[PDB]
Design a binder for these strands. Structure first.
Ligand SMILES: [K+]
Ligand SMILES: [K+]
Ligand SMILES: [K+]
Ligand SMILES: [K+]
Ligand SMILES: [K+]
Ligand SMILES: [K+]
Ligand SMILES: [K+]
Ligand SMILES: [K+]
Ligand SMILES: [K+]
Ligand SMILES: [K+]
Ligand SMILES: [K+]
Ligand SMILES: [K+]
Ligand SMILES: [K+]
Ligand SMILES: [K+]
Ligand SMILES: [K+]
Ligand SMILES: [K+]
Ligand SMILES: [K+]
Ligand SMILES: [Mg+2]
Ligand SMILES: [Mg+2]
Ligand SMILES: [Mg+2]
Ligand SMILES: [Mg+2]
Ligand SMILES: [Mg+2]
Ligand SMILES: [Mg+2]
Ligand SMILES: [Mg+2]
Ligand SMILES: [Mg+2]
Ligand SMILES: [Zn+2]
Lengths: 101, 204, 129
RNA sequence: UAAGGAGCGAAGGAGGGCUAGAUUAUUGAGCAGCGAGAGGUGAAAUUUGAUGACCUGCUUAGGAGUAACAGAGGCGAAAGCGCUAGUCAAGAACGAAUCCGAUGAUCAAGGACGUAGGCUGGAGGAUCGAAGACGAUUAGAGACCGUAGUAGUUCCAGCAGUAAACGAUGCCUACGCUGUUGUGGUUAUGAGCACGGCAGAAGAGAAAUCUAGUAGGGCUUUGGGGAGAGUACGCGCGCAA
């Protein structure tokens, strides 16, 4: 029986879409189906900022950040616990997740 | 056999900026001036605008590149070789719900050097407005891009390198673009993204 | 008192290993070089924060001998069509250099990103485990 | 004619063919610096390095691709289509006092297109990798994992004719409740027209749910308990498959 109204993907009014590759296992997954995750990570860890304050030559310094978008296939997303199995009424709830660091 | 002992330091010098001397580089000692030329000439380095100027700590997002050209005693003299924005700036600028506008153009200095320029701009969401996204229509993007090319042609084509370098320092092209193109659509983050030297004329 | 005598330090930090390498400002002359795998025995430890830290100290020592005082840092992962997150160990090289006496200039992420790319290894199904 | 075709005006789109350019990246060679390991995994071995690897510079040579922006967004008959300029035909929608007047719906036979993999000839050959060969793991692995490696993967001129080619829902044409959110034009600024998404309701249905409500409107395809069987014989296409 049909488990989801949208077939588990975001394609509508189209024939075909570009593929992308999974970060964890390099499998091909369609772009409109892949699980997506955003990361904004400081170059320097929080446990070093108190040393940075005496190491730097400049009057003040702003740490550089690094930015990423990651893609996962279903198997990897479930195994890494980005997503979890949910009850028949919960399946319908849609909410934006946090940006990781 | 401590080869490090047998090395000569030389000081790097630059022009058209507030700070003249920027560091020093090693070479193995050699008998003949022809050898030292062939070893030092052709080397390259890069420096942040914040290091070679006295300036607001905000201006750290840009780097300049120089190629070694000539030797005189202790000093190596080096010439302009390109400009680049820092990775943090490029990556941090792009945001969801807005359009990027991008362009590539070629120009010729009076000195005969040919340069290739990359340019970027972003659309902006107006105040007192409630729609979630502020994308730009594809035909409108072509109007902005058409304008950008005449601005770059007016500002930089057929000039000296001494003039170009100061225009890049003061960020005049970005400022002109934001002024000129406002009539088409509102924009933000207008910048020259990269400058690359393509051909240098065969000269003595 | 003294002026700041600067060197470049390059750092590569993958899932498998970490490589540390100091040069003149031109990048065309080498002052000192080490890796996590140089110091440790077991292959599974070459990425270890500990092996990175041991390997950094040797590099810091040779630079202090050659008379350097200050450092600019350019750091990367593997990039290309492969992984582009900085690996473990990368962020401990930097903190170690600060416990040694060195003054830090500027830090930059210089991972090679591709505007589009050649085909990645692994086939259409990917690794099965 | 809230039937069709021809035409006018302003505009929109990863629709298609061609010409000329582009920022990086992955490999390969040259040269320079340094002097011991690199790679790969859950953990390791094949393997490569003093004929100087790895990593960092500068030069070059090729052949693919267009990241992030990028979406329950757009375009196309479907298959499918994402860098920038210039060029060549035709189409859809919208606005309105343009022209002709039944020119129309659906369709055996017959004709044109059709991802990928495959085949016939030419160009080329970076990356990836059927077959084949090793290293491990196992009672045994011929497999999964790692090293390596060929046909193919790209282009031009053709053949072939299959897909879970699926929203598993034929094509025209009707009658039908509300709220919300998009895309492109137009606007007495109140709204409409075309193409969508979403959430309830009422009916319906074995339920799950709703392209499924109401109904002797028109036309084509198609099923009749499991198996044997989409197989045998004959016939038609194809170089073969
Ligand atoms: K399909
Ligand atoms: K999904
Ligand atoms: K390892
Ligand atoms: K080792
Ligand atoms: K060892
Ligand atoms: K065209
Ligand atoms: K084909
Ligand atoms: K085999
Ligand atoms: K065996
Ligand atoms: K294998
Ligand atoms: K391979
Ligand atoms: K055909
Ligand atoms: K045919
Ligand atoms: K069929
Ligand atoms: K449609
Ligand atoms: K039914
Ligand atoms: K038969
Ligand atoms: Mg099931
Ligand atoms: Mg498993
Ligand atoms: Mg070598
Ligand atoms: Mg792009
Ligand atoms: Mg028409
Ligand atoms: Mg083929
Ligand atoms: Mg039909
Ligand atoms: Mg039967
Ligand atoms: Zn995966």
């Amino acid at each position: 029986t049909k488990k989801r109204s949208n077939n588990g993907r975001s394609k509508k009014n189209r024939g075909h879409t570009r593929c992308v590759r999974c970060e964890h296992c390099s499998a091909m997954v369609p772009n409109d189906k892949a699980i997506k995750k955003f990361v904004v990570r400081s170059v320097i860890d929080a446990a070093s900022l108190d040393d940075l304050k005496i190491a730097t030559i400049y009057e003040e310094y702003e740490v550089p950040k690094s930015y990423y978008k990651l893609n996962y296939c279903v198997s990897c997303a479930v195994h890494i616990k980005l997503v979890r199995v949910r009850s028949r009424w919960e399946r319908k709830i849609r909410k934006e997740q946090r940006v990781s660091a | 056999k401590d080869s490090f002992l047998k090395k000569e330091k030389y000081n790097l010098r630059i022009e058209n900026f507030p700070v003249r001397e920027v560091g020093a580089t090693l070479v193995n000692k050699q008998s003949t001036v022809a050898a030292l030329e062939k070893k030092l000439v052709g080397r390259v380095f890069e420096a942040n605008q914040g290091d070679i100027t006295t300036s607001d700590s905000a201006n750290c997002y840009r780097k300049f590149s120089f190629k070694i050209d000539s030797l005189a005693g202790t000093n190596a003299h080096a010439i302009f070789n390109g400009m680049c924005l820092t990775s943090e700036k490029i990556k941090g600028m792009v945001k969801r719900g807005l359009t990027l506008i991008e362009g590539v153009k070629d120009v010729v200095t009076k000195e005969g050097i040919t340069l290739r320029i990359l340019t970027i701009a972003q659309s902006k969401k107006e105040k007192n407005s409630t729609k979630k996204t502020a994308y730009a229509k594809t035909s409108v993007v072509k109007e902005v891009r058409k304008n950008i090319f005449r601005i770059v042609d007016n500002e930089l084509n057929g000039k000296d390198i001494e003039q170009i370098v100061k225009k890049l320092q003061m960020e005049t092209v970005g400022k002109e673009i934001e002024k000129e193109c406002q009539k088409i659509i509102p924009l933000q983050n207008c910048h020259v993204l990269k400058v690359k030297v393509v051909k240098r004329p065969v000269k003595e | 008192e003294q002026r700041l005598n600067f060197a470049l330090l390059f750092i590569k930090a993958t899932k498998n290993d970490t490589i540390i390498h100091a040069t003149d400002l031109t990048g065309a002359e080498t002052l000192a070089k080490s890796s996590g795998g140089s110091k440790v025995k077991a292959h599974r430890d070459e990425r270890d924060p500990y092996a990175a830290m041991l390997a950094t100290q040797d590099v810091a020592a040779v630079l202090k001998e050659k008379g350097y005082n200050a450092v600019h840092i350019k750091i990367r992962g593997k990039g290309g069509n492969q992984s582009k997150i900085i690996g473990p160990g990368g962020s401990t090289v930097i903190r170690t250099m600060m416990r040694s006496e060195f003054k830090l200039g500027r830090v930059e992420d210089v991972t090679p990103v591709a505007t589009d790319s050649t085909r990645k290894k692994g086939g259409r199904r990917g690794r099965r485990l």
